[PDB]
């Protein structure tokens, strides 16, 4: 016997991650998640045994371990554009928009009392932010309108719509709200518009569907225990659970992973 | 070599979806919840409408 | 943007129901349930999609809705003879009993300390209520007794039983309780009785097994919101859950339904 | 419309039971359980419908009720020799023992 | 979902094609206020535009 | 078979001569609802009109 | 290559039949069966080939 000294620990540490290039195993640089409120490591280990058939009832002659899937789940509270690329399995795209003038667009079916987004194209699919000079005219819905060139006040069947009591626009997002009580836009009426687009740098997170491989690392600085840090040479980050946007608590993103093996030499988990 | 060594893995599907509630109850949201359609009609002003309950 | 005004609502309203005649679709008149403490409408909607097999892994090319079963459950607190006909899947029977005299009945096996019901016939199967003049005699159980006519004090093997210390009768229900310590009725002893039946109108709820079709309607008068009322042209009322008779809370009857479709024109749900 | 009067109820009552003779349907006398603290009646009713196959997706053309099993559970607090015959599925036997002397027995 | 967050750097979501379906139950009478639980499932519009666009 | 398909571009079939024969069994009593399984075999009416016409 | 649009289908339809008079080929009027829960079309096609012997 002896007077023994245990190693109690409270876990506090940062979690790092570096993606691999697509279809290869080259690093790209470890990113910083943020404050991860939990970081668990679980193991599902099924076995396989053989009960002997020479004496006794169900005597275990030999057993062996089939698999031991090293994995775990974690959440994170820092929400930037970079972690949403991992949760939505997508990629950050830092683009701009072209400063164009006289951008013309048609809305053929119209119910009044409905929002409308200006400029849903293939270049900027989520919309156009920044509108300088807005003008629109109305027409009957049974007439097909060709706005291939020229102004819209000069085309046939056009009637200029007053800006008061008929619609309402904000210029920081380019959103048209047709009024629910607008006598000029009642009936079966279509609308052709024009607007001017500014130029600013904007960020999209285009959420495709591909599994993201990479290495995981938790450097820990424990406040009461002898600290130690973990390293996973290859995991596969997948989204887990739900991502509740609105509520009372603060928004967390629950992740999960599954530690694979990089090659025939380097193994799955390295505790330093 | 080995017992259950993961040589390669891949993602079959990733179903992006979600649920939400709403508290504003008008005639327009009930068309979405009941999978139906709003019908704004009238009734004909008729007189001497006769009906039997057997 | 705008200053928007929501439509908040607290639901309070009455629930109506009219049965159909058996094997047809004719109405009979909407009954009033009572205060229904809850009335829910749920929808189980399974879908069917087809993942594309030309590019990508599990890309949804097209999806469609197989079924959308409009249905719901509700409870009710008003317990009369009319709602028990719906919960027990039966039918209210408003009958009478025939005012007869000298009604004679035999009880061949007798354990003492047991209740006995007078007049379990095919006309009034639950019993006979209202007894005027009760007399009974005892005999040995090995002797078959024929009480086809005449009084019972004059038949063979008869011994008149004293009313004190041997049995006990209430006349409002016609129930015989043989005393647990009665020396006159100990052993293997049978009993033949006589009694007189009064005449009063009585109500039974004969609980058969048939599905009850009908239309459902909830006219609502909401105390804080813009009210609106529902109408189901054909549902099928079925009993749901349990009906706890004794306890602390007040007795509720949980129902359920499943909105069918009346014909090829009228659909399943009409919100006004 | 009207001023309606509901029928609210708190359930308190006694529960009676009379056995049948074995293999027959003859009564024997209703016994008294005691204070039964609960007495519920539940119904498990599965149905059978036929979705039409001429127009639409899963349009209920006709439905019908297969079974409606009327049943229930209850407890009881009075424990005598008579209710234990029902719970243990047995039978009360009121016997005696023979007054004998010099009863000899071995425990090996 | 255009969001105007009271404490964080706000951002808005866009789904090019979903399929709104009713979910859960719609309790009419009770104590709390009536809510309608919906659900959706983000499909893909064509071979170019993908399922989710965070701006 | 005139078809009115709920999700696809509908089309209808026409067989100028078949021979209806009973097939399988016709279970009278049971749990499911009684169905009658038929079968046929598309013959040819003459030397001009063929066996199957999809419109 | 292109952005192709398939033709997916769920089959729902009615099945009609008109008898012939006995020993002839004259029509008599198409009857309505009812809801037919399935309607399959199968083809048994045996072939005949000749393996070369040169």
Residue numbers in the entry:
A (entry chain C), C (entry chain A): 2 to 273
B (entry chain B): 56 to 109
D (entry chain F): 2 to 109
E (entry chain B), F (entry chain J): 219 to 273
G (entry chain J): 2 to 55
From the study:
Here we have determined by cryo-electron microscopy (cryo-EM) structures of the head and tail components of YSD1, a phage infecting Salmonella Typhi. We investigated the structure of the recently characterised phage YSD1 as an example of flagellotropic χ-like phages and more generally phages with long, non-contractile tails. Samples of YSD1 imaged by EM showed characteristic features of siphoviruses: an icosahedral capsid and a flexible tail tube of ~220 nm in length. Cryo-EM analysis of YSD1 allowed structure determination of the head and tail components at resolutions of 3.8 Å and 3.5 Å, respectively, and the generation of de novo models for the major capsid (YSD1_17), auxiliary protein (YSD1_16) and tail-tube protein (YSD1_22).
The 3.5 Å-resolution structure of the YSD1 tail reveals a robust but pliable assembly based on hexameric rings strung around a central spine of the tape measure protein. Our structure of the YSD1 tail reveals that the helical tube is built from hexameric rings of the three-domain tail-tube protein. The rings are stacked with an axial rise of 41.2 Å and a twist of 19.7° to form a right-handed helix. Clear density in the cryo-EM helical reconstruction allowed structure determination of the first two domains. Only weak density is present for the third, C-terminal domain, indicating that it does not strictly follow the helical symmetry of the tail tube. The main body of the tail tube is formed by domain 1, a sandwich composed of two four-stranded β-sheets with a long β-stranded loop extending strands β3 and β4 (β-hairpin). Assembly of the tail tube involves the formation of a continuous antiparallel β-barrel connecting the largest β-sheets of six subunits on the internal face of the tail tube. In the assembled tail, domain 2 stabilises the hexameric ring by wrapping around adjacent subunits and locking them into place like a latch. Unexpectedly, for such an elongated assembly subject to substantial shearing forces, there are relatively few inter-ring interactions. These interactions along the helical axis rely almost exclusively on the extended β-hairpin, which contributes 93% of the inter-ring contact area. The placement of negatively charged aspartate and glutamate residues in the assembled tail tube appears as a right-handed helical track through the tail tube.
